[PDB]
Amino acid sequence: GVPTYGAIILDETLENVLLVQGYLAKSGWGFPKGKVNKEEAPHDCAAREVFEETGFDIKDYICKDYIELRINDQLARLYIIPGIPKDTKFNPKTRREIRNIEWFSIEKLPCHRNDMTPKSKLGLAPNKFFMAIPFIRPLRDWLSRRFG
Numbered sequence: 001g002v003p004t005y006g007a008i009i010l011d012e013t014l015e016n017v018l019l020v021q022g023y024l025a026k027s028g029w030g031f032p033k034g035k036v037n038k039e040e041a042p043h044d045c046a047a048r049e050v051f052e053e054t055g056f057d058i059k060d061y062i063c064k065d066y067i068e069l070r071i072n073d074q075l076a077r078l079y080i081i082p083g084i085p086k087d088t089k090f091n092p093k094t095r096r097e098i099r100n101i102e103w104f105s106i107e108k109l110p111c112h113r114n115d116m117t118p119k120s121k122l123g124l125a126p127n128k129f130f131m132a133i134p135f136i137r138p139l140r141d142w143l144s145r146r147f148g
């Protein structure tokens, strides 16, 4: 697949992250991100997707040196943007693609989906944070290294 770029936006306390909820196939909560256009630079795609999806422009706050994961053939890179005040008014451009935009406490998000071992059944229970989950442990580790 085509690389995706976006951001992990944190508040001033570093306890909360900004997630967006789409529709249909993309009905759960995840970090704002999207497909790179041909000839577009990563930092530019990231700002554009985050602007389209949240109304907030990160261009002045991106530091070039993020968390990146190869998930089933596809790279997803989210630039880390700390210190965005919780009272920022976020508004998507395309309300046809984004249902809602909320802050979530990092410490209450799961960093793995639960199994179904009290049902003797294989796989994972559904989780509305499926798309965010793979970034939560790496973000927690990055915040420990960079801060304390």
Ligand SMILES: CCCc1cc(C(=O)NCc2ccc(F)cc2)[nH]n1
Pocket: 020, 021, 022, 023, 025, 026, 027, 028, 029, 030, 031, 032, 033, 053, 097, 098, 130, 131
């Ligand atoms: C395996 C289930 C597939 C899936 C993918 C997503 C998702 O990405 N939602 C968040 C989101 C929505 C819209 C958007 F523009 C940016 C992020 N949710 N469920």
